[PDB]
From Swiss-Prot, chain A:
This is Large ribosomal subunit protein mL45. It comes from the Eukaryota. GO terms for cellular component: mitochondrial inner membrane; mitochondrial large ribosomal subunit; mitochondrion. Component of the mitochondrial large ribosomal subunit (mt-LSU). Within the mitochondrial ribosomes, required to direct the nascent polypeptide toward the tunnel exit and position the exit at a distance from the membrane surface. Belongs to the mitochondrion-specific ribosomal protein mL45 family. The lineage of its organism: Eukaryota, Metazoa, Chordata, Craniata, Vertebrata. GO terms for molecular function: RNA binding; structural constituent of ribosome.
UniProtKB/Swiss-Prot annotation, chain F:
It is found in: Mitochondrion. InterPro entries: Ribosomal_bL17, Ribosomal_bL17_sf. This is Large ribosomal subunit protein bL17m. It comes from the Eukaryota. GO terms for molecular function: protein domain specific binding; structural constituent of ribosome. The keyword Oxidoreductase does not apply. Belongs to the bacterial ribosomal protein bL17 family. It comes from Homo sapiens.
Swiss-Prot record, chain G:
GO terms for biological process: mitochondrial translation. Component of the mitochondrial large ribosomal subunit (mt-LSU). Mature mammalian 55S mitochondrial ribosomes consist of a small (28S) and a large (39S) subunit. The 28S small subunit contains a 12S ribosomal RNA (12S mt-rRNA) and 30 different proteins. The 39S large subunit contains a 16S rRNA (16S mt-rRNA), a copy of mitochondrial valine transfer RNA (mt-tRNA(Val)), which plays an integral structural role, and 52 different proteins. The modification N6-acetyllysine is found at K95. Coiled coil: none annotated. The lineage of its organism: Eukaryota, Metazoa, Chordata, Craniata, Vertebrata. One of its GO terms (cellular component) is mitochondrial ribosome. Its main location: mitochondrion. Isoform 1 is ubiquitously expressed. Isoform 2 is heart-specific. This is Large ribosomal subunit protein mL39. Belongs to the mitochondrion-specific ribosomal protein mL39 family. Changing G268V: In COXPD59; uncertain significance. Residues 32-98 form the TGS domain.
Curated annotation (Swiss-Prot), chain H:
It comes from the Eukaryota. This is Large ribosomal subunit protein mL43. The gene is MRPL43. One of its GO terms (molecular function) is structural constituent of ribosome. GO terms for cellular component: mitochondrial inner membrane; mitochondrial large ribosomal subunit; mitochondrial ribosome; mitochondrion. It is found in: Mitochondrion.
Length: 243, 108, 166, 289, 45, 152, 297, 148
């Protein structure tokens, strides 16, 4: 008649690697992006080949010179690397990543993308099914900004490559029971996005993995939800509501 | 007393699952015209009750802060006020207890 | 210790076809280690059984017991997880389908009688199971009238044939 | 711990048995199982019927057009070209039609030579019920020919099963003589009518109309109903006996709970007696001439 | 389902006394109407 | 057998019951609002009615003075009861001390109730207001009343 | 206008109504999201995200609780009366009402109109097929009146009979049987042109549609449907039909010095399930509703 | 006991005695081990009498998987679809021969309770008995205690 309950644990991950130890952590990515790319306002209106040049072309020339010196740096650090076939490589990497995400593949998606965008693409979809498929590409992809950092924390540098992409996707997000929820079936919709790829240069191997995607503030709204969303107000505590 | 045998699970089910021991479903639950926090017939709402209890507690706190020590009990009536609101003419001989908040809509 | 009720919310179903019904949802939720008796929890579950969620909350708010508020909070958090994760839009279109009780881990203490003898104080613990299904609640089974009994008796008298020969 | 392995193996086998019993897996066809041989099964089916079948006709009849379409779709979706065996499969359509026509005409001839008092609608409904989907599916399932039928869908729809049954019937007709196939279809179809009621295979609506029509065709005036016996007219369980009288002569009698069902049963009994298909008729002679 | 109800539930503050007075006058008139049963249609004694 | 007998026992006898009722009456005179079981508040209202009656009968009377000194163990409540609650009900007879029922207590789940005097500087409790005189039933009753009035 | 059996006319009416509803629901492309706000009193500061021309206020109340669906008759949309079964259009604010409210007037008017429409529907199917019947209109009588009226024109051969208590009992039984089955009051803002084109039979209905469409430049009437019966009424109605717990028709009065032919005017009283009374008040209201009452001027 | 095990009726699978008799047994999958002292009888059977058993009835196919196991078993499937799997662990040649002969002679019906060993399809010939049998009819069927 003298027994209690055991099993005393917590469900929270605190700090414990760097508390009196001699082994650090060898990361393979970074936090966010280095510099946010600012697309032009008239991108949708001038979606053809080219147009007339604007006034004061010094800023674009400076950005081009920065991209060229970053390419020179990444070529001096690691030779044998092209730029013209880089958009095609990024395109096929994005396609195979979307395909392996549709086929519910993790051991390949972990090495296809970086350690940053994987939770954003595996959290609110783990208990759901997707029917994504590629149909046809419209405007070819091009590179808009080439940058690289020089963080001397653990002797690791990275090279984020912002490459725009414009094509047509087919999204079909169902529910865990089998009913439709978000997108429709076969609908060749048109949407563009700016995807950036980051590669660990200091790694002895290095694989071009998708870092993240930046959405412009002037982007059109997404398609509405097929269900009804309820937005309740705050909890009215015994007092008074002034709003 | 001591049993000669043992009751079965069937007898236990017949004894504990009878409609006499089961909780009856009451049909006196409705809604409230004000606030609305699920009240009952012939029973006051808990939300407005808590509100008026907090208000009475605050008024008693203010009275105790104005009176000070115990054993007082004034021989005149009392009247509570709020933000602003000048005292009327028929409230001269009554004790004025002003608060520090706006006047509610349920207190006239 | 076994835990198989909290894992039923992860069963993924294949996408249905346009020529298939809507199929109602199934939400499983339960708590562990609750200081209460299993008989009273089963009485509360029998009081609930298959009714609306709002009616169940109303009956539990005015139920003078210890586990009433516990079951109320369980139903509230289950409805919240259903409308936030299980893809549920309507808050009043739910009904409890299954509601039962179990038994928890027990300890041993002393009782101290009126002599050198004593008793075995066994700390009684229990749990509470509940399942939420969308859609309107099904109507109760109506009692069969005299016509049903007459038809059944006629069928029984017509089904009997010759026996113990050929 | 308890040292052992044989008892543990038996317990694991019992657990696996309970698992497969509680969760029944989808049944697989007999062709995909290891212990299976197509030619051996064909020979066994040909030798068990006490006949003389042929390999080519059986291989041609035991296939279907849906099977050929599925095979060509599978060979076109992958890329393997197999036009040296697929173009020589030969669908079993004309043979099936010939077998169907032969079975129909043989059944009609038998019903004409055995029951001369059967009208055209009666023999038509009889030959339609004998050639129905349920009976041929039951015969095909009891003959273990569904496992040999090369077609899609494991449960096999009744249409494909009836089609392959008529196809193998036509193949047997083309192989052996007409008398052998006639005796075969006799022994495999007419034996099902043993103990079955006539109108259960006909399912009429108004027996009195057909009865009075047959009576007018037999130079009879008009039947009239009379109450023979009765027991309990005010209780919940009534019993009546209506006897049909034609020219002051009884012809039949039918019981019933009320008067309408009793008259209907009497009319049915009279119509079955006028056609010669009763319970005291001559049984079918299952012998050889 | 159907809840419990009575007669003075859905009435205002100026209708309950009116209904009381009306039903009182009604029962008084009904009691006063059955005062002379012999002048109506009595059964033979 | 307790036919026609009230006097709900509470304490260990009549003396303890009277002491508890006197304490409740003193608390009700002081704070003007007390939550307690239904029987306790019922007896408190029944005694407070007669207390108000005796305080309204007069002040110079020695009987009422002794009763107020006995039923009030705080002394200071006697002048208040004689100079506030007595001139207030000068137009009323026995119509005061409204009783309202509350649900239960968050301790032992017991039936309780709250009573208070009329007027009251404290905010009034949410009274169970009846239906408005504009509903369908009320409008039909008003129409029937107007019809029988015009027909008379 | 031609000779039609007493079946094909309602068949064509209901199929044309279904085609009109299909056209109305298919006129919108996809699903447009609206932001309807709750400016009531119980739960203030609540905004809903619903669809356009698809979502109904009943579905919006279902997002709250079952009480908001059991105690709801008429909705307030920007100060205009809106029933519980009607799709919304633009984004605005909504407010729920009930019978036990501060000023229950619009709900009472809607309930009276619904009861009049139900009486007309239950009386238009209780006559001989050889005797043609016509439905004039449903005049909006105040709540102070004894009972609502509904003018019905019968045949010229029946201008001298008086219905006894048996016909009244049969009508009450039919009304109770119709209330027993749950049939919503499906409404739709149908254009006046197609509204008058669907009928083209009774001249009274055409005149009523013209008079109700001549008041608004948009030429939009308010049509309702109860399972398989179409009638023209004013304003919104009630959601479910099971609200009426006590339904009983009084008598009938015939007016003559107003039109050469003889027209009928039937009356009746009804009480909802939320405001049920005792048997005494019931018989009092039944006897008081038997008197003649008119408020057409 | 009979109240614990299911039962059935005595009937044919497809009326074999009326028309022509067919062989109910189809396949016989034998599992004889290569090395061991528990399948000697099955080995000797497959060596000496399996050819005679196959030539006796051409409608029965015999499969010899020859899988190295420990308990020799035999699978017997019939026309109805019943699969009865028995083990011939440590049995002589005569015992296995008698067992396979009994399996070939029987059909696919269950070996449960027979329930009424006699079965007929036309039980009534001279009219089934009814309570009105052996009762003469009165004049005009007049019921007793009447006037007309
Ligand atoms: Mg006590
Ligand atoms: Zn409230």
């Amino acid at each position: 008649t003298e027994k209690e309950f055991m099993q005393h644990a917590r469900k929270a991950g605190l700090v414990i690697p760097p508390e009196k130890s001699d082994r650090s952590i060898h990361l393979a990515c970074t936090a966010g992006i280095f510099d946010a790319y600012v697309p032009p306002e008239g991108d949708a209106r001038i979606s053809s080949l080219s147009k007339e040049g604007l006034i004061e072309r010094t800023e674009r020339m400076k950005k081009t010179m920065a991209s060229q010196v970053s390419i020179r740096r990444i070529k001096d650090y690691d030779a044998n690397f092209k730029i013209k076939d880089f958009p095609e490589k990024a395109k096929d990497i994005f396609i195979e990543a979307h395909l392996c995400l549709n086929n519910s593949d993790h051991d390949r998606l972990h090495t296809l993308v970086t350690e940053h965008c994987f939770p954003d693409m595996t959290w609110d979809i783990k208990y759901k099914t997707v029917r994504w498929s590629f149909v046809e590409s419209l405007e070819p992809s091009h590179v808009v900004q080439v940058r690289c950092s020089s963080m001397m924390n653990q002797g690791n540098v990275y090279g984020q490559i912002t490459v725009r992409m414009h094509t047509r996707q087919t999204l079909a997000i169902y529910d865990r029971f089998g009913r439709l929820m978000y997108g429709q079936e076969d609908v060749p919709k048109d949407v563009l996005e700016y995807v950036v790829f980051e590669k660990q240069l200091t790694n002895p191997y290095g694989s071009w993995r998708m870092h993240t995607k930046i959405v412009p503030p002037w982007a059109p709204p997404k398609q509405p939800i097929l269900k009804t969303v309820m937005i309740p107000g705050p909890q009215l505590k015994p007092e008074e509501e002034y709003e | 007393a001591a049993p000669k045998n043992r009751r079965t699970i069937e007898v236990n089910r017949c004894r504990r699952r009878n409609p006499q021991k089961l909780i009856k479903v009451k049909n006196n639950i409705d809604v409230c015209p004000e606030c609305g926090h699920l009240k009952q017939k012939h029973v006051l709402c808990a939300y407005c009750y808590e509100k008026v209890c907090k208000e009475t507690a605050e008024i008693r706190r203010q009275i105790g802060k104005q009176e000070g020590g115990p054993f007082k009990a004034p021989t005149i009536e009392t009247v509570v006020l709020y933000t602003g609101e000048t005292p009327s003419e028929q409230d001269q001989g009554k004790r004025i207890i002003e608060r520090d908040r706006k006047r509610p809509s349920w207190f006239t | 210790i076994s835990r198989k009720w909290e894992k039923k919310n992860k069963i993924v179903y294949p996408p249905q076809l346009p020529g298939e019904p809507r199929r109602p949802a199934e939400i499983y939720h339960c708590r562990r280690q609750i200081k209460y008796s299993k008989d009273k929890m089963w009485y509360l579950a029998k009081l609930i059984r298959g009714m609306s969620i709002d009616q169940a909350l109303a009956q539990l708010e005015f139920n003078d017991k210890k586990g009433a508020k516990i079951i109320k909070e369980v139903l509230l958090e289950a409805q919240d997880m259903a409308v936030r994760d299980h893809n549920v839009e309507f808050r009043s279109n739910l009904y409890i389908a299954e509601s039962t009780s179990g038994r928890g881990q027990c300890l041993k203490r002393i009782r101290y009688h009126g002599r050198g003898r004593f008793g075995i104080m066994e700390k009684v613990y229990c749990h509470y199971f509940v399942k939420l299904v969308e859609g309107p609640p099904p109507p109760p089974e109506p009692p069969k009238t005299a016509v049903a009994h007459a038809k059944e008796y006629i069928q029984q008298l017509r089904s009997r044939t010759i026996v113990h020969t050929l | 711990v308890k040292k052992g392995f044989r008892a543990a193996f038996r317990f694991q086998k019992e657990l696996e048995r309970q698992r497969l019993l509680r969760c029944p897996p989808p049944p697989v066809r007999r062709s995909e199982k290891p212990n299976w041989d197509y030619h051996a099964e064909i020979q066994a089916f040909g030798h068990r019927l006490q006949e003389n079948f042929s390999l080519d006709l059986l291989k041609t009849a035991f296939v279907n057009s849906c099977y050929i379409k599925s095979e060509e779709a599978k060979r076109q979706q992958l890329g393997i070209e197999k036009e040296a065996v697929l173009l020589n499969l030969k669908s079993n359509q004309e043979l099936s039609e010939q077998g169907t026509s032969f079975s129909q005409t043989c059944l009609t001839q038998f019903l004409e030579d055995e029951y001369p008092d059967m009208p055209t609608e009666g023999i038509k409904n009889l030959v339609d019920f004998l050639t129905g989907e349920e009976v041929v599916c039951h015969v095909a399932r009891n003959l273990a020919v569904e496992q040999l039928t090369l077609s899609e869908e494991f449960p096999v729809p009744p249409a494909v099963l009836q089609q392959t049954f008529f196809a193998v019937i036509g193949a047997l007709l083309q192989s052996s003589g007409p008398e052998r196939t006639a005796l075969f279809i006799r022994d495999f179809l007419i034996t099902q009518m043993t103990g079955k009621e006539l109108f259960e295979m006909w399912k009429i609506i108004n027996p009195m109309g057909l009865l009075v029509e047959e009576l007018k065709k037999r130079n009879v005036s008009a039947p009239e109903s009379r109450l023979t016996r009765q027991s309990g007219g005010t209780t919940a369980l009534p019993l009546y006996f209506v006897g049909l009288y034609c020219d002051k002569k009884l012809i039949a009698e039918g019981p019933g709970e009320t008067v309408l069902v009793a008259e209907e049963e009497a009319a049915r009994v009279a119509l079955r007696k006028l056609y010669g298909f009763t319970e005291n008729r001559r049984p079918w002679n299952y012998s050889k001439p | 389902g159907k809840s419990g109800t009575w007669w003075d539930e859905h009435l205002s503050e100026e209708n309950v006394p009116f209904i009381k007075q009306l039903v009182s006058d009604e029962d008084k008139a009904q009691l006063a109407s059955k005062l002379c049963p012999l002048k109506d249609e009595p059964w033979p004694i | 057998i307790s036919h026609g007998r009230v006097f709900r026992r509470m304490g260990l006898g009549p003396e303890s019951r009277i002491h508890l009722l006197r304490n409740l009456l003193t608390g009700l005179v002081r704070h003007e609002r007390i939550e307690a079981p239904w029987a306790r508040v019922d007896e408190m209202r029944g005694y407070a009615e007669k207390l108000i009656d005796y305080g309204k009968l007069g002040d110079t009377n020695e009987r009422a003075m002794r009763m107020a000194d006995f039923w009030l163990t705080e002394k200071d409540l006697i002048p208040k009861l004689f100079q506030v609650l007595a001139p207030r009900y000068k137009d009323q007879t026995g119509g005061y001390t409204r009783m309202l029922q509350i649900p239960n207590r968050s301790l032992d789940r017991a039936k309780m109730a709250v009573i208070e005097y009329k007027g009251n500087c404290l905010p009034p409790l949410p009274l169970p207001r009846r239906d408005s005189h504009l509903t369908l039933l009320n409008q039909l009753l008003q129409g029937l009343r107007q019809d029988l009035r015009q027909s008379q | 206008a031609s000779q039609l059996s007493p079946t094909e006319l309602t068949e064509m009416r209901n199929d044309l109504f279904n085609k009109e509803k299909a056209r109305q629901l298919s006129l919108t492309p996809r699903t447009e999201k609206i932001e309807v706000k709750h400016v009531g009193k119980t739960d203030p500061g609540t905004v809903f995200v619903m669809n356009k021309n698809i979502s109904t206020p009943y579905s919006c109340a279902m997002h709250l609780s079952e009480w908001y669906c059991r105690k709801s008759i008429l909705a307030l949309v920007d100060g205009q009366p809106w029933d519980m079964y009607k799709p919304l259009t633009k984004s605005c604010e909504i407010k729920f009402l009930t019978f036990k409210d501060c000023d229950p007037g619009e709900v009472n008017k809607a309930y009276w109109r619904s009861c009049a429409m139900m009486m007309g529907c239950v009386i238009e199917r209780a006559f001989k097929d050889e005797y043609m019947v016509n439905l004039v209109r449903a005049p909006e009588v105040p709540v102070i009146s004894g009972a609502f009226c509904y003018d019905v024109v019968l045949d010229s051969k029946l201008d001298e009979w008086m219905p006894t208590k048996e016909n009244l009992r049969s009508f009450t039984k039919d009304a109770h049987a119709l209330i027993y089955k749950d049939l919503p009051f499906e409404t739709l803002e149908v254009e006046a042109k197609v509204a008058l084109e669907i009928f083209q039979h009774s001249k009274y209905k055409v005149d009523f549609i013209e008079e109700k469409a001549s008041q608004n430049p948009e030429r939009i009437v308010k049509l309702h449907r109860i399972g398989d019966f179409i009638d023209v009424s004013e304003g919104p109605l009630i959601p479910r039909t099971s609200i009426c717990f006590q339904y009983e028709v009084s008598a009938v009065h015939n007016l003559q010095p107003t039109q050469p032919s003889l027209i009928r005017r039937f009356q009746g009283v009804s009480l909802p399930v939320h405001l049920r009374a005792h048997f005494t008040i019931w018989d009092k209201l039944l006897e008081r509703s038997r008197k003649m009452v008119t408020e057409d001027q | 006991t009979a109240r614990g095990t299911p039962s059935r009726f005595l009937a044919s699978v497809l009326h074999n005695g009326l028309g022509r008799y067919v062989q109910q047994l189809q396949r016989l999958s034998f599992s004889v081990s290569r090395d061991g002292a528990s399948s000697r009888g099955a080995r000797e059977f497959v060596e000496r009498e399996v050819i005679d058993f196959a030539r006796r009835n051409p409608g029965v196919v015999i499969y010899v998987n020859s899988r190295p196991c420990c308990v020799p078993r035999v699978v017997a499937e019939y026309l109805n679809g019943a699969v009865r799997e028995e083990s011939i662990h440590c049995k002589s040649v005569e015992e296995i021969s008698t067992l396979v002969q009994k399996l070939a002679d029987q059909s696919g019906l269950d070996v449960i309770r027979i329930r009424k060993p006699f079965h007929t399809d036309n039980p009534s010939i001279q009219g089934q008995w009814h309570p009105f049998t052996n009762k003469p009819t009165t004049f005009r069927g007049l019921r007793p205690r009447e006037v007309q």
